[PDB]
């Protein structure tokens, strides 16, 4: 572990000043980091997880705090610092423009195809990445990558999504790189329906029976037929005739060559 990658906060060195939005592992709010011992005040998220009846050791808390310290990819984000106190307190560059699920909906009549072949590289890359650290997301989906700036996207909320999870994660509790690729295909889905909600109005509890009976998410419509393919090939249900994120890096860079040949929107 390279413990330096992680500062570890005193309560005192960061301060809470506004809400970013409140969830079922805790709430993140926007502030400033004030290092000791510098002259600076630094915009950041902190996300202030719910409190644990029985905690982890800290060790164990720390352990998994310098992995994800060590994340080291423009797509990925980074755990800046930390605070143990009687809750974990995460400290992480702010993304100003919020998750990609909202952004895309609040800015679907603006949004033409670089965009959003370049988003599906950023994630692919970021993927990648992960993979090639031996880490496994288990909730990708578009609520959870980020937006630094419009083209600069990056990965978070890692370290029961049931309409975003393989087959087998959802049957077996089998999570993989692979069961990954499965939720990146939703993931681009979303993205190119413009943050539509994946199998509206069917039941969680309903979903492992319509893909058992082969069913899967519809063709987009700005989607040509390439790009809905390599999609329908993140659903195959044998694990390993998906594609690779690293395949899927070159096949999503290719189309983002030429986007106006692969996806069809009203004013490009
Ligand atoms: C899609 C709806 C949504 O996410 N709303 C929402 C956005 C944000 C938010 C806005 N701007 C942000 N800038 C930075 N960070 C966040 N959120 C945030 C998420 C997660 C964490 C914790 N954390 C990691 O998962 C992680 C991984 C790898 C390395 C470091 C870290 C890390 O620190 C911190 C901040 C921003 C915040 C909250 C939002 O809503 C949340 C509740 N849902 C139910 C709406």
Not at 143 to 168: C, S, Y
Not at 178 to 202: A, C, H, N
């Amino acid at each position: 572990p390279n413990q330096a990658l992680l500062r570890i906060l005193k309560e005192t060195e960061f301060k809470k000043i506004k809400v970013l939005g409140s969830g079922a592992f805790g709430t993140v709010y926007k502030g400033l980091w004030i290092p000791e011992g510098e002259k600076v005040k630094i915009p950041v998220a902190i996300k202030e997880l719910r409190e644990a009846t029985s905690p982890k050791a800290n060790k164990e808390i720390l352990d998994e705090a310098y992995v994800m310290a060590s994340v080291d990819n423009p797509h990925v984000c980074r755990l800046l610092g930390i605070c143990l106190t009687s809750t974990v307190q995460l400290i992480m560059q702010l993304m100003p423009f919020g998750c990609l699920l909202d952004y895309v909906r609040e800015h679907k009549d603006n949004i033409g195809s670089q965009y959003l072949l370049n988003w599906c590289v950023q994630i692919a890359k970021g993927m990648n990445y992960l993979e090639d650290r031996r880490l496994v997301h288990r909730d990708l989906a578009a609520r959870n990558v980020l937006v630094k700036t419009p083209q600069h996207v990056k990965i978070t909320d890692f370290g029961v999504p049931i309409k975003w999870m393989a087959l087998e994660s959802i049957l077996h509790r089998i999570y993989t790189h692979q069961s990954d690729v499965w939720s990146y295909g939703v993931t681009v889905w979303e993205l190119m329906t413009f943050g539509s909600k994946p199998y509206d109005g069917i039941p969680a509890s309903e979903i492992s029976s319509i893909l058992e009976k082969g069913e899967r998410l519809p063709q987009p419509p700005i989607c040509t037929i390439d790009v809905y393919m390599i999609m329908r090939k993140c659903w195959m249900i044998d694990a390993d005739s998906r594609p690779k994120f690293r395949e899927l890096i070159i096949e999503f860079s290719k189309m983002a060559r030429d986007p106006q040949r692969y996806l069809v929107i009203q004013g490009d």
